[PDB]
Amino acid sequence: XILDXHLXRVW
Amino acid sequence: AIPELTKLLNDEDQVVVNKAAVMVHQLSKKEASRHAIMRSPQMVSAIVRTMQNTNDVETARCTAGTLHNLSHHREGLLAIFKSGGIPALVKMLGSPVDSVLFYAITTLHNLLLHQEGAKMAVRLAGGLQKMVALLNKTNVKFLAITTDCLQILAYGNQESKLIILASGGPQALVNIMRTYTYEKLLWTTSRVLKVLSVCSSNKPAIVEAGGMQALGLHLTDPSQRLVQNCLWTLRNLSDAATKQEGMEGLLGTLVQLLGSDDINVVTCAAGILSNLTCNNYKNKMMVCQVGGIEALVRTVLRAGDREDITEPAICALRHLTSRHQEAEMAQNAVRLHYGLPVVVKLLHPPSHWPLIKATVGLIRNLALCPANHAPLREQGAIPRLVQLLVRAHQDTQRRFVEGVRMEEIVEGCTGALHILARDVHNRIVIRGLNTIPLFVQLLYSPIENIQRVAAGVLCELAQDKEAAEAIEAEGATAPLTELLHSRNEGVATYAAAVLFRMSE
Ligand SMILES: OC[C@H]1O[C@H](O)[C@H](O)[C@@H](O)[C@@H]1O
Ligand SMILES: OC[C@H]1O[C@H](O)[C@H](O)[C@@H](O)[C@@H]1O
Ligand SMILES: OC[C@H]1O[C@H](O)[C@H](O)[C@@H](O)[C@@H]1O
Numbered sequence: 001x002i003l004d005x006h007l008x009r010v011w
Numbered sequence: 012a013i014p015e016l017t018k019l020l021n022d023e024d025q026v027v028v029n030k031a032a033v034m035v036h037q038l039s040k041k042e043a044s045r046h047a048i049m050r051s052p053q054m055v056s057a058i059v060r061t062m063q064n065t066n067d068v069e070t071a072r073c074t075a076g077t078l079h080n081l082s083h084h085r086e087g088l089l090a091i092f093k094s095g096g097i098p099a100l101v102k103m104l105g106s107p108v109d110s111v112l113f114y115a116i117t118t119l120h121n122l123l124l125h126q127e128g129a130k131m132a133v134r135l136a137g138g139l140q141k142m143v144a145l146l147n148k149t150n151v152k153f154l155a156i157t158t159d160c161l162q163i164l165a166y167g168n169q170e171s172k173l174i175i176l177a178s179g180g181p182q183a184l185v186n187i188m189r190t191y192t193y194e195k196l197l198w199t200t201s202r203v204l205k206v207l208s209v210c211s212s213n214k215p216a217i218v219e220a221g222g223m224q225a226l227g228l229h230l231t232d233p234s235q236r237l238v239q240n241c242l243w244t245l246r247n248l249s250d251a252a253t254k255q256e257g258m259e260g261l262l263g264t265l266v267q268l269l270g271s272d273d274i275n276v277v278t279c280a281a282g283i284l285s286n287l288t289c290n291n292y293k294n295k296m297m298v299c300q301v302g303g304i305e306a307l308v309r310t311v312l313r314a315g316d317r318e319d320i321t322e323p324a325i326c327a328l329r330h331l332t333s334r335h336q337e338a339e340m341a342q343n344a345v346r347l348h349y350g351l352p353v354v355v356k357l358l359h360p361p362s363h364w365p366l367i368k369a370t371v372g373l374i375r376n377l378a379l380c381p382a383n384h385a386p387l388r389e390q391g392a393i394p395r396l397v398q399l400l401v402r403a404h405q406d407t408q409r410r411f412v413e414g415v416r417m418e419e420i421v422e423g424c425t426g427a428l429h430i431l432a433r434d435v436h437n438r439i440v441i442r443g444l445n446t447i448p449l450f451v452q453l454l455y456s457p458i459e460n461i462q463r464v465a466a467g468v469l470c471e472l473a474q475d476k477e478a479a480e481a482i483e484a485e486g487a488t489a490p491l492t493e494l495l496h497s498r499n500e501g502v503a504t505y506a507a508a509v510l511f512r513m514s515e
């Protein structure tokens with residue numbers, strides 16, 4: 001879940 | 012609350028420490044208790060120390076998760092940096108537990124994105140080697156974060172580029188481009204390859220790993236950011252891809268992209284085609300076979316005075332019009348696709364020296380085909396080549412103008428004139444412009460290539476009796492006799508032929 005959340009935040 | 016838990020984090024009993032780690036994590040999940048943790052430089056030092064030294068799966072997850080929550084804020088990013096958290100996080104990259112790995116890579120990403128000093132700290136902690144090693148993982152979202160970290164670290168840092176190379180970075184990155192279709196990953200990986208492709212060491216390695224062909228796979232992807240990065244990287248690599256095979260597909264796509272409405276796409280395609288056709292007769296053949304001449308002439312016409320397009324396109328045309336099986340057909344095709352007028356136009360202002368040099372070379376090749384002798388004459392090529400030559404020679408006699416030596420213009424123009432002088436009407440025009448005195452002066456050039464083209468053009472002219480007498484009247488016998496002993500066989504052969512025609 002951390003990955004999806006991070007992708008969205010950064011890009 | 013904060014100093015109580017900091018005392019429990021520094022406990023000699025690790026059980027007490029494990030229980031304190033779970034509490035600190037839940038506090039990092041709320042804004043009030045998170046700012047409390049970030050304000051204390053003693054608490055953040057304990058979380059970092061706990062993480063690096065723990066052998067417990069949950070404590071590693073909770074301490075790394077806590078540091079991740081801090082990385083969302085400028086105060087927390089500075090806390091993790093000053094508390095020595097970067098080398099601790101780097102250690103967590105070797106973690107067999109995914110959740111620990113995902114906290115570490117994302118936290119390091121955040122530090123590399125927004126925190127000063129972090130790029131140097133990650134390099135020193137051995138981060139690059141660990142990150143390259145993880146490129147064998149198969150999670151495309153994790154791969155996208157890892158590759159972006161490599162991009163941040165490699166950008167503007169030749170040291171990091173060399174480390175990525177030593178760790179097998181090129182091969183691993185090319186594999187990603189051949190294996191996945193996940194756009195975000197393809198794009199971040201292409202950005203890493205772009206950064207590496209300006210490195211003189213990484214470039215042959217990427218090409219050897221099959222990078223040209225791999226990047227070629229994605230040139231028709233709907234994602235324009237992916238296409239463009241692939242095109243930039245391809246252009247960078249293309250001067251070192253002369254020996255590569257399996258390029259038919261790439262070459263075909265590049266010709267197609269010449270018709271694009273995106274001038275950046277057009278620019279790159281022209282540049283890659285130019286580099287790949289330079290002295291590669293097989294590539295010249297392939298590009299001609301898929302309609303390359305027509306595509307390139309249209310590109311030159313549409314580009315007008317945009318030299319970022321016309322220079323590579325004219326270079327490609329120059330390559331395609333010599334030294335391959337279908338060169339003759341290409342020389343004709345340039346005329347048949349209405350290219351001769353625009354080619355002569357580019358000899359004139361406002362063209363800069365790189366474009367003029369390329370255009371003269373192209374005209375030299377075009378003139379190999381007799382059906383181009385008259386159209387080139389009618390379109391005004393001879394007077395302009397002579398004006399270029401006369402001024403270029405003067406400039407050398409007085410003394411790199413826009414990166415180009417005027418000697419190159421002298422040689423190029425004299426070379427083009429040497430080929431045009433094969434036609435009887437062209438020789439009338441060349442002679443009528445009082446060029447013989449200049450051609451004879453060029454025999455005394457220190458540069459052998461200039462002596463060769465000067466001697467060659469005089470040799471073509473001297474086949475007419477009137478011109479032979481003028482050549483002699485200019486005192487050409489003296490330099491020509493000396494040139495019989497040139498170590499350059501071309502110079503010596505031509506000089507003998509001129510001397511012969513002057514004696515009848
Ligand atoms: O062009 C991409 C680069 O832009 C900036 O220089 C950023 O500082 C760097 O992190 C990034 O890799
Ligand atoms: O996107 C920034 C740069 O990327 C690559 O290095 C290209 O070669 C260059 O033309 C481009 O401007
Ligand atoms: O057209 C075939 C050949 O014609 C002439 O011999 C040219 O000097 C040479 O450069 C060219 O390759």
Ligand SMILES: [Cl-]
Pocket residue numbers: 391394395
């Ligand atoms: Cl003119």
Ligand code: NA
Pocket residue numbers: 333334
């Ligand atoms: Na040539």
